[PDB]
Design an enzyme around this catalytic site. Structure first.
Site, PDB file in Angstrom:
ATOM      1  N   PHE A   5       0.840  -1.206   0.159  1.00 28.63           N
ATOM      2  CA  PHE A   5       0.162  -0.033   0.000  1.00 28.63           C
ATOM      3  C   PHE A   5       0.886   1.296   0.054  1.00 28.63           C
ATOM      4  O   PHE A   5       1.903   1.338   0.834  1.00 28.63           O
ATOM      5  CB  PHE A   5      -0.801   0.005   1.339  1.00 28.63           C
ATOM      6  CG  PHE A   5      -1.878   1.144   1.392  1.00 28.63           C
ATOM      7  CD1 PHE A   5      -3.036   1.331   0.217  1.00 28.63           C
ATOM      8  CD2 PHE A   5      -1.696   2.400   2.046  1.00 28.63           C
ATOM      9  CE1 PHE A   5      -3.951   2.323   0.430  1.00 28.63           C
ATOM     10  CE2 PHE A   5      -2.479   3.264   2.059  1.00 28.63           C
ATOM     11  CZ  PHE A   5      -3.547   3.201   1.197  1.00 28.63           C
ATOM     12  N   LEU A   6       0.521   1.987  -0.962  1.00 27.62           N
ATOM     13  CA  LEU A   6       1.145   3.566  -0.982  1.00 27.62           C
ATOM     14  C   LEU A   6       0.002   4.479  -0.989  1.00 27.62           C
ATOM     15  O   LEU A   6      -1.108   4.321  -1.514  1.00 27.62           O
ATOM     16  CB  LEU A   6       1.929   3.823  -2.186  1.00 27.62           C
ATOM     17  CG  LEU A   6       3.353   2.796  -2.283  1.00 27.62           C
ATOM     18  CD1 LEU A   6       3.301   1.784  -3.353  1.00 27.62           C
ATOM     19  CD2 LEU A   6       4.474   3.533  -2.498  1.00 27.62           C
ATOM     20  N   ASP A  56      -0.639   9.199  -5.089  1.00 26.09           N
ATOM     21  CA  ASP A  56      -0.073   9.132  -6.406  1.00 26.09           C
ATOM     22  C   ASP A  56       0.649  10.329  -6.588  1.00 26.09           C
ATOM     23  O   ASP A  56       0.399  11.268  -5.704  1.00 26.09           O
ATOM     24  CB  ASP A  56      -1.120   8.807  -7.484  1.00 26.09           C
ATOM     25  CG  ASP A  56      -2.541   9.487  -7.356  1.00 26.09           C
ATOM     26  OD1 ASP A  56      -2.583  10.140  -6.120  1.00 26.09           O
ATOM     27  OD2 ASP A  56      -2.998   9.578  -8.371  1.00 26.09           O
ATOM     28  N   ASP A  85       0.799   2.780 -19.938  1.00 20.19           N
ATOM     29  CA  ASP A  85      -0.003   3.526 -19.142  1.00 20.19           C
ATOM     30  C   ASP A  85       0.869   4.431 -18.027  1.00 20.19           C
ATOM     31  O   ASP A  85       0.268   4.583 -17.226  1.00 20.19           O
ATOM     32  CB  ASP A  85      -1.037   2.585 -18.447  1.00 20.19           C
ATOM     33  CG  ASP A  85      -2.345   3.190 -18.464  1.00 20.19           C
ATOM     34  OD1 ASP A  85      -2.439   4.495 -18.510  1.00 20.19           O
ATOM     35  OD2 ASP A  85      -3.242   3.042 -17.602  1.00 20.19           O
ATOM     36  N   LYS A 114       1.315   7.520 -16.636  1.00 20.99           N
ATOM     37  CA  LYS A 114       0.514   8.949 -16.268  1.00 20.99           C
ATOM     38  C   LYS A 114       0.750   9.042 -14.989  1.00 20.99           C
ATOM     39  O   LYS A 114       0.887   8.179 -13.996  1.00 20.99           O
ATOM     40  CB  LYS A 114      -1.085   8.672 -16.826  1.00 20.99           C
ATOM     41  CG  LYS A 114      -1.584   7.697 -16.070  1.00 20.99           C
ATOM     42  CD  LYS A 114      -3.154   8.058 -16.191  1.00 20.99           C
ATOM     43  CE  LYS A 114      -3.877   7.192 -17.280  1.00 20.99           C
ATOM     44  NZ  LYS A 114      -5.398   6.847 -16.743  1.00 20.99           N
ATOM     45  N   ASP A 166      -0.333   0.051 -11.565  1.00 17.11           N
ATOM     46  CA  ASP A 166      -1.189  -0.139 -12.515  1.00 17.11           C
ATOM     47  C   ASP A 166      -0.788  -0.781 -13.858  1.00 17.11           C
ATOM     48  O   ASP A 166      -0.941  -0.165 -14.664  1.00 17.11           O
ATOM     49  CB  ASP A 166      -2.181   1.180 -12.652  1.00 17.11           C
ATOM     50  CG  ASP A 166      -2.809   1.772 -11.514  1.00 17.11           C
ATOM     51  OD1 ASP A 166      -3.910   2.057 -11.407  1.00 17.11           O
ATOM     52  OD2 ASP A 166      -1.799   2.042 -10.673  1.00 17.11           O
TER      53      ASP A 166
END
Lengths: 275, 309, 292, 65, 254
Positions: free
Chosen positions: C82-83, C86, C127, C129, C145
């Protein structure tokens, strides 16, 4: 359109007595719930009405300084949400500050005025800002539920513009209708303070503002109603229109703004109630 | 809340999860859409804007050919919308090769779509997301426009328009060129495409990019000049293309009659102001001509080798 | 299954629901992604298969750890470290004051190390981003992700439906190239670098054509000299407006000479001439990197 | 059974609004902002805004709760 | 690219861990090599029917070999194992896999959709989600950069696919060795050259090391017309693969 909208069907009431009955019912219901949970701290309906007036003014001053600039439609929608929500609920159950912040949040989302949550809370100590965002997110769905999921609000500004176009086109008796604008706008603001949004259609409100501004300038446009609006065929409809406009004007006349010291005393009382 | 008994699963997607439930009060089957929270980045936006759009627009409309919002309950975390249960849609009928779309069936589908759209545009609302899988059907053969998550009110000069365009197969050329102000044409073009699908059982203009979609449009219908689109070059995303000649319409739709060809040509006009409207489309001779539309009750309802070791 | 206690629901994507949960036997807080195998007429989603299969092999400090996979008849659980937030949220919060330059350099160095590890293991993220880059409180940033990730042991075809969002799309994809390559990740990283430096998106286009025109307006409309074979691309049109490249002294004012040269190498039109991840790691821009 | 078009009959409880095609004929368009060429390219005319404003002005003017 | 050597090294390392157990065929009480050959041929035919890539077929065959290396299967469930492996490979590699309905239909409804889904779940459980397996196709793609004759490429691909049919002589060789032998054979057949020195320094494989697989592949090539399974040659008869299947194998190899 207004003529088959949910606002007309469910949120336009016959008289001020209905509004008083609903607000008294909300107050008495909260009193019964509080006494069932387990006396001189409860607020009478008139005190709640005064507090609601003060917080509507606070919401107006919050929206006037919002960055980026809020359109008029968003402010009108937020004020209508506030009035509707406190028609059926009591201030001593939900603090009107969180409620008006939520009303503005919901109005911005509904009226397609795209602002992110950080921008919204930036218009308010950062810690208080995140607490405010948490409370707004908590109360959004409750506000939507208490509105019966009737979210589209019809404001008088577009009817006002349409009336101005019609006056410029089909009423050459009035030289320049534009001079009627500013004064009429002021009257509109006064209308927004009273209870007329829950009693009359937006077109009626806009026409009342326009004709009041015209009468203040010494111009009579009885022919505009009788001839341009084709009301000389149906005299009864013209009679009801004049009575409705007179009722709106009297409603503006009888309005009494909240007093500062009374508002402070009632704010202390309500803060004690929520404590 | 707690008055619905979930009894099936109808589908999932990026936005919502749909299941089929029982009303448990009127004992009527309904469809419940749970609105997902999306990515964890969008966890501080409150209620989803698409859900709010659908609720607020559908609470102000009531037509036989527009989906009805029966209820909109929601837990303080997840919000759920209740619609009428529709058994199929037009995409399923188009892709199902077992059944045959007679001219009367096509006229019926087009007529209900256009009646719903005329009611919609009379209220100054654009659907903006018309495609065959958004035209639902029920057991009685009543078509209803659904998926109002992109619909927006038009008419006000405010440029609140922020993209949110339909899948590119049905996007009008003025939207592909990046128009910010538009009217009913964006719906009408999509209607034409849907009609073309009904006439061919395959997508009319299946591009894989915006530029490729514009190329396919200009190859099929011809590159527009300035006579048929007076201000085309003023659009922000305007790109100059080759002067394609275009295919005659009666060559693409060989079985279509003259009245149907006139309707299709009206729906595919490049100038958005000259493109016919839903009211004008309903008045065309195609709909009042013989044969009439099929009644709703009669509408149709939907190597190798085994190894021995 | 019963070893984790769901603290709360974090997100809900296209296929699975993400919870923040706690490990009862150890106490560590994890992110639990639940995909219900029931209600699926095709079985396990192919995106989940690719994500698990690729993330099992990617053991790097700068990539989110797939701690465990619990497979059941009707449910499938993925456990991630868990972070809390973002990089997009960090950039939104740290606006109007700006991320410090050393922090930006360290973040880019870590992202480049993670991407180089991904590319040397024949994996294409596809991906990249800011919303998919997760930071912790200790000053580390991780790629996350891997839902669009692909292995390129054989060349990977381009799919219209699965692709990064518009602002970080590379021009070769916008012009309709048939096959992916490692340079699309480098383009996205360069866009994120510029966004971190200038606190706003480098190319904030509204549509595909608008994004292409923004790229052309900033970097100049390409021709066969700077980008050989560009005129033969499927979506190339001879009538594209011919803008001129504006010097990097204004697109990224705060950047210095080495930073501008690195950003220019990352933003090369030609996919073959675009800098690679490890060659970017060898740049003189990263002579003095320290984690803050 | 052939189809016959029937116009929508929605009661507006207000004065009659002139048809859209006539707005420039009776001179309403003399008092609205002119549409940019970009707007006409997109299909947006000043007649749309004028008709919307008039319809909102005359809607529910004769109604009583 | 600068990661190309790193990718090749990673593939060489990873082909060891994904290598199926050697000799699992005689540990299977029911199914044998001939049944496996029929299954792989049917897989080739199915991949042709739905226009799947060759990498998908290589991955499916690898999954089948790895799955049969730790589980015993009745001869009636072998085709179900093949179908589940092909569906998994399509999900991993294809741009969009065919629906499960198409897969159950291609086996003339021998198994239900539920059986296919359950067997796919079982295969995923057995493999522990390790589906990114190096194949002969990937190593051939890596080797093709050191040439540029399209006929040689097509013939090397044809030989690599032919290596899948037989499990007895080829399951003891790593995919890299098979790909190298196939490349050498195609070069000798078309151009007559040998294993290039660049490939020797890249991979470390000399002619002597590739020799055993070399004679095995040459013998397979010679007897291909008489082989009971012919869908691979029918696949490579097309002009898309330059029609290299109907070429003339070398009668000697020096």
């Amino acid at each position: 359109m207004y003529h088959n909208s949910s606002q007309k069907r469910h949120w336009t009431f016959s008289s001020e007595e209905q509004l008083a009955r609903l607000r008294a019912d909300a107050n008495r219901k909260f009193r019964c719930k509080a006494v069932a949970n387990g006396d001189p701290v409860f607020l009478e309906p008139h005190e709640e009405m005064t507090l609601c007036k003060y917080y509507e003014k606070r919401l107006l001053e919050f929206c006037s300084v919002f960055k980026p600039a809020m359109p008029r439609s968003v402010v009108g929608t937020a004020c209508m949400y506030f009035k509707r929500f406190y028609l059926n609920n009591s201030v001593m159950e939900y603090h009107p500050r969180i409620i008006m912040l939520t009303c503005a949040f919901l109005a911005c989302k509904v009226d397609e005025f795209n602002v992110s949550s950080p921008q919204f809370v930036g218009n308010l100590s950062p810690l208080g800002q995140e607490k405010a965002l948490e409370q707004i997110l908590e109360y959004e769905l409750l506000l939507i539920q208490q509105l019966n999921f009737h979210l589209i609000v019809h404001n008088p500004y577009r009817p006002f513009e349409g009336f101005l176009i019609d006056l410029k086109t089909r009423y050459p008796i009035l030289e320049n209708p534009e001079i009627l604008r500013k004064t009429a706008d002021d009257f509109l603001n006064r209308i927004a303070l009273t209870d007329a949004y829950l009693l009359y259609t937006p077109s009626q409100i806009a026409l009342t503002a326009i004709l009041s501004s015209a009468s203040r300038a010494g111009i009579t446009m009885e022919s505009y109603l009788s001839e341009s609006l084709m009301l000389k065929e149906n005299r009864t409809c013209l009679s009801q229109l004049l009575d409705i406009m007179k009722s709106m004007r009297n409603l503006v006349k009888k309005y009494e703004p909240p007093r500062s010291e009374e508002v402070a005393v009632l704010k202390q009382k309500l803060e004690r109630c929520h404590s | 809340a707690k008055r619905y008994e979930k009894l099936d699963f109808l589908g999932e997607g990026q936005f919502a999860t749909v299941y089929k439930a029982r009303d448990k009060n009127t004992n009527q089957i309904v469809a419940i859409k749970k609105i997902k929270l999306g990515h964890r980045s969008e966890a501080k936006d409150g209620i989803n804007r698409t859900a709010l759009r659908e609720i607020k627009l559908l609470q102000e409309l009531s037509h036989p050919n527009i989906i009805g919002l029966l209820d909109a309950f929601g837990h303080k975390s997840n919000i759920s919308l209740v619609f009428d249960f529709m058994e199929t849609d037009l995409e399923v009928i188009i892709k199902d090769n077992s059944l045959v779309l007679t001219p009367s069936h096509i006229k019926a589908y087009m007529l209900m779509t256009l009646q719903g759209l005329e009611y919609l545009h009379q209220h100054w609302i654009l659907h903006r997301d018309l495609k065959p899988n958004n035209l639902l059907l029920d057991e009685n053969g009543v078509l209803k426009l659904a998926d109002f998550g992109l619909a927006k009110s038009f008419g006000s000069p405010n440029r609140a328009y922020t993209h949110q365009v339909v899948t590119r197969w049905y996007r009008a050329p003025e939207l592909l060129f990046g128009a910010r102000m538009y009217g009913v044409g964006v719906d009408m073009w999509a209607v034409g495409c849907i009609l073309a699908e009904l006439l061919l059982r395959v997508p009319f203009l299946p591009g894989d990019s915006d530029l490729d979609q514009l190329t396919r449009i200009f190859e099929t219908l011809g590159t527009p000049t300035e006579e048929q689109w007076p201000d085309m070059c003023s659009l922000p995303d305007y790109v100059t293309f080759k002067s394609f000649p275009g295919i005659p319409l009666h060559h693409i739709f060989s079985a279509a009659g003259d009245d149907l060809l006139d309707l299709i040509q009206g729906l595919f006009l490049f100038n958005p102001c000259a493109r016919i409207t839903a009211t004008q489309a309903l008045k065309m001779k195609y709909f009042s001509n013989r044969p009439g539309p099929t009644p709703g009750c009669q509408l149709p309802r939907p190597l190798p080798k085994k190894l021995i070791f | 299954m019963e070893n984790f206690q769901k603290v709360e629901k974090i997100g809900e994507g296209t296929y699975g629901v993400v919870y923040k949960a706690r490990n009862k036997l150890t106490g560590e807080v994890v992110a639990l992604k639940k995909i219900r195998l029931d209600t699926e007429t095709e079985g396990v989603p192919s995106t989940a298969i690719r994500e698990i299969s690729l993330l099992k092999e990617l053991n790097h400090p700068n990539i989110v750890k797939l701690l465990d996979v619990i497979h059941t008849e009707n449910k499938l659980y993925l456990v991630f470290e868990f972070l809390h937030q973002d990089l997009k949220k960090f950039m939104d919060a740290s606006a109007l004051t700006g991320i410090p330059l050393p922090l930006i350099k360290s973040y880019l160095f870590q992202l480049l190390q993670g991407l180089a590890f991904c590319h040397s293991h024949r994996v294409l993220h596809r991906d990249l981003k800011p919303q998919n880059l997760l930071i912790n409180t200790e000053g580390a940033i991780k790629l996350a992700d891997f839902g669009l990730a692909r292995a390129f042991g054989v060349p990977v075809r381009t799919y219209t439906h699965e692709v990064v969002t518009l602002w970080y799309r590379a021009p070769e994809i916008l012009l309709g190239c048939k096959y992916y390559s490692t340079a699309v990740d480098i383009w996205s990283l360069g866009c994120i670098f510029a966004e971190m430096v200038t606190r706003r998106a480098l190319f904030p286009g509204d549509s595909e054509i608008d994004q292409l025109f923004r790229i052309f307006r900033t970097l100049g409309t390409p021709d066969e000299v700077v980008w050989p074979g560009v005129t033969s691309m499927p979506d190339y049109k001879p009538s594209f407006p011919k803008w001129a490249r504006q010097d990097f002294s204004k697109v990224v004012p705060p950047l210095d000479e080495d930073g501008r040269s690195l950003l220019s190498q990352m933003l090369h039109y030609d996919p073959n001439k675009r800098i690679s991840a490890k060659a970017a790691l060898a740049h003189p821009f990263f002579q003095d990197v320290t984690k803050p | 059974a052939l189809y016959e078009y029937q116009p929508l009959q929605i009661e507006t409880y207000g004065p009659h609004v002139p048809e859209l095609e006539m707005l420039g004929r009776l001179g309403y368009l003399n008092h609205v902002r002119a549409a940019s060429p970009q707007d006409l390219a997109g299909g947006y005319t000043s007649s749309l805004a004028c008709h919307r404003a008039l319809q909102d002005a005359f809607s529910g003017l004769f109604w009583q709760p | 690219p600068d990661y190309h050597e790193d990718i090749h090294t990673y593939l060489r390392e990873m082909e060891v861990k994904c290598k199926p157990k050697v000799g699992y065929m005689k540990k299977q009480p029911d199914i044998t090599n001939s049944m496996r050959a029929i299954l792989v041929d049917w897989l080739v035919e199915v991949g042709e029917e739905y226009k799947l890539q060759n990498e998908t077929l290589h991955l499916a065959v690898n999954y089948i070999d790895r799955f049969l290396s730790s589980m015993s299967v009745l001869r009636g469930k072998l085709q179900l194992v093949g179908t589940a492996a092909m569906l998994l490979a399509s999900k991993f590699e294809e741009i969009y896999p065919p629906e499960v309905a198409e897969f159950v239909y291609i086996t003339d409804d021998t198994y239900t959709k539920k059986q296919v889904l359950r067997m796919e779940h079982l295969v995923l459980k057995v493999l522990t989600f390790d589906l990114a397996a190096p194949t002969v196709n990937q190593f051939l793609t890596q080797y093709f950069l050191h040439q540029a004759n399209c006929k040689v490429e097509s013939l090397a691909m044809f030989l690599g696919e032919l290596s899948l049919i037989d499990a007895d002589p080829y399951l003891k060789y790593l995919p890299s060795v098979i790909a190298g032998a196939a490349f050498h054979l195609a070069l000798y057949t078309v151009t007559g050259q040998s294993w290039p020195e660049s490939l020797i320094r890249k991979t470390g494989y000399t002619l002597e090391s590739l020799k055993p697989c070399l004679m095995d592949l040459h013998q397979t090539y010679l007897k291909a017309p008489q082989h009971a399974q012919q869908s691979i040659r029918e696949k490579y008869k097309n002009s898309k693969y330059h029609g290299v299947s109907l070429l003339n194998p070398p009668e000697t190899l020096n």
